[PDB]
Enzyme design. Structure first.
Site, PDB file in Angstrom:
ATOM      1  N   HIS A  95       0.818  -1.258   0.177  1.00 17.37           N
ATOM      2  CA  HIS A  95      -0.066  -0.093  -0.057  1.00 17.37           C
ATOM      3  C   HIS A  95       0.816   1.222   0.084  1.00 17.37           C
ATOM      4  CE1 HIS A  95      -3.266  -2.657   1.219  1.00 17.37           C
ATOM      5  NE2 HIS A  95      -2.352  -3.303   1.641  1.00 17.37           N
ATOM      6  N   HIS A 118       2.960  -5.690   2.949  1.00 17.83           N
ATOM      7  CA  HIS A 118       2.122  -7.187   3.621  1.00 17.83           C
ATOM      8  C   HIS A 118       2.423  -8.465   3.044  1.00 17.83           C
ATOM      9  CE1 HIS A 118      -1.162  -3.841   4.927  1.00 17.83           C
ATOM     10  NE2 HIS A 118      -0.186  -3.867   5.733  1.00 17.83           N
ATOM     11  N   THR A 198      -8.877  -4.667   3.207  1.00 13.72           N
ATOM     12  CA  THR A 198      -9.569  -4.317   2.132  1.00 13.72           C
ATOM     13  C   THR A 198     -10.809  -5.265   2.242  1.00 13.72           C
ATOM     14  OG1 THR A 198      -8.946  -6.002   0.661  1.00 13.72           O
ATOM     15  CG2 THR A 198      -7.704  -4.175   0.684  1.00 13.72           C
TER      16      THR A 198
HETATM   17  C1  LIG Z   1      -8.432 -11.980  -4.413  1.00 10.50           C
HETATM   18  C2  LIG Z   1      -7.402 -11.784  -3.248  1.00 10.50           C
HETATM   19  O1  LIG Z   1      -6.312 -11.116  -3.576  1.00 10.50           O
HETATM   20  C3  LIG Z   1      -7.900 -11.973  -1.943  1.00 10.50           C
HETATM   21  C4  LIG Z   1      -8.824 -12.818  -1.683  1.00 10.50           C
HETATM   22  C5  LIG Z   1      -9.786 -13.119  -0.616  1.00 10.50           C
HETATM   23  C6  LIG Z   1     -10.911 -13.909  -0.780  1.00 10.50           C
HETATM   24  C7  LIG Z   1     -11.335 -13.921   0.514  1.00 10.50           C
HETATM   25  C8  LIG Z   1     -10.705 -13.278   1.495  1.00 10.50           C
HETATM   26  S1  LIG Z   1      -9.410 -12.379   1.063  1.00 10.50           S
HETATM   27  C9  LIG Z   1      -6.914 -11.805  -0.686  1.00 10.50           C
HETATM   28  O2  LIG Z   1      -5.851 -12.291  -0.467  1.00 10.50           O
HETATM   29  N1  LIG Z   1      -7.181 -10.472  -0.237  1.00 10.50           N
HETATM   30  C10 LIG Z   1      -6.610  -9.897   0.802  1.00 10.50           C
HETATM   31  C11 LIG Z   1      -5.285 -10.498   1.411  1.00 10.50           C
HETATM   32  C12 LIG Z   1      -4.667  -9.674   2.345  1.00 10.50           C
HETATM   33  C13 LIG Z   1      -5.130  -8.162   2.516  1.00 10.50           C
HETATM   34  S2  LIG Z   1      -4.118  -7.220   3.702  1.00 10.50           S
HETATM   35  N2  LIG Z   1      -4.054  -5.744   2.974  1.00 10.50           N
HETATM   36  O3  LIG Z   1      -5.203  -7.197   5.026  1.00 10.50           O
HETATM   37  O4  LIG Z   1      -3.009  -7.825   3.914  1.00 10.50           O
HETATM   38  C14 LIG Z   1      -6.411  -7.600   1.950  1.00 10.50           C
HETATM   39  C15 LIG Z   1      -7.000  -8.524   1.001  1.00 10.50           C
HETATM   40 ZN   LIG Z   2      -2.489  -5.101   2.517  1.00  9.05          ZN
END
Ligand SMILES: CC(=O)/C(=C/c1cccs1)C(=O)Nc1ccc(S(N)(=O)=O)cc1
Ligand SMILES: [Zn+2]
Ligand SMILES: [Cl-]
Length: 259
Positions: A95, A118, A198
């Protein structure tokens, strides 16, 4: 299908309408108040075991870019610290901001860094990532702050492929990338229970946020800011400020691994 993003019209203040857990009891990111985080002697040593990591591909998903790993076996794992059992690396992403004074999701005494990395891992006792995200201890995300200064040599292979994934839905082969090149010297960390930052904002994450930032060059982060949120041929929307602001801590305590 959902149409969330980081703009005025679809940004974090809107997410709660399609994702009511946005207003939940363990949302991420949070501000880390260094003067109320307590040292915890119960924390075991943190173990980052990335020697056998197998990167496969890099993808622009219209929100960030993901470097994806082979997680069909225990090739790259995170263990120890606050974690029970073995968490498998599946992807990393960043990010970042439009300017060097913003971009991180976590803050430290309200300080925003230029970016945040991340590294996303899933608990192998749940068998697959999709099952793990349904559990309160399903994921471990290792968060690393980026500040602008000296270039990070281990980041340049990522910077140089971004020209080939400018727009949403573009991917490129990205084999033999070593994520150990993105770690700081010290593994000192803060930890707390939280969420994906997200949609779908699921409350399934043990956050491990390293105290020591890595330094990247102005030129390196300028190349992140040339990516696009939009698809090919669509009006250009630069991929910048893809961060969620700090959320209420509520009934949580942040624990430090260090004095
Ligand atoms: C399609 C995809 O990329 C993802 C799918 C998922 C499907 C179901 C739950 S997540 C995924 O991994 N999402 C994600 C991973 C880390 C973080 S964070 N910023 O909190 O690290 C944010 C979003
Ligand atoms: Zn992230
Ligand atoms: Cl700093």
């Amino acid at each position: 299908s959902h149409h969330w993003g980081y703009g005025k019209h679809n940004g974090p203040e809107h997410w709660h309408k399609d994702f009511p857990i946005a207003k939940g009891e363990r949302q991420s990111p949070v501000d880390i108040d260094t003067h109320t985080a307590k040292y915890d002697p119960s924390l075991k040593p943190l173990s980052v075991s990335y020697d056998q990591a197998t990167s496969l591909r890099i993808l622009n998903n219209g929100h960030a870019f993901n470097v994806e790993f082979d997680d069909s076996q225990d090739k790259a794992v995170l263990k120890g610290g606050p974690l029970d059992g073995t968490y498998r690396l599946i992807q990393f992403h960043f990010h970042w901001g439009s300017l060097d004074g913003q971009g991180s999701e976590h803050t430290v005494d309200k300080k925003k860094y230029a970016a945040e990395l991340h590294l996303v891992h899933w608990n192998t006792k749940y068998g697959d990532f999709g099952k793990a995200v349904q559990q309160p201890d399903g994921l471990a995300v290792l968060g690393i702050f980026l500040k602008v200064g000296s270039a990070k040599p281990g980041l340049q292979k990522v910077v140089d492929v971004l020209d080939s994934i400018k727009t949403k839905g573009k991917s490129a082969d990205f084999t033999n990338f070593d994520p150990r090149g993105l770690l700081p010297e010290s593994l000192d960390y803060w930890t707390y229970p939280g969420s994906l930052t997200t949609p779908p904002l699921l409350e399934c994450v043990t956050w491990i946020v390293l105290k020591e930032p890595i330094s990247v060059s102005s030129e390196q982060v300028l190349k992140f800011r040339k990516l696009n949120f939009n698809g090919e041929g669509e009006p250009e929307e630069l991929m910048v400020d893809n961060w969620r602001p700090a959320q209420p801590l509520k009934n949580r305590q942040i624990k430090a691994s260090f004095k």
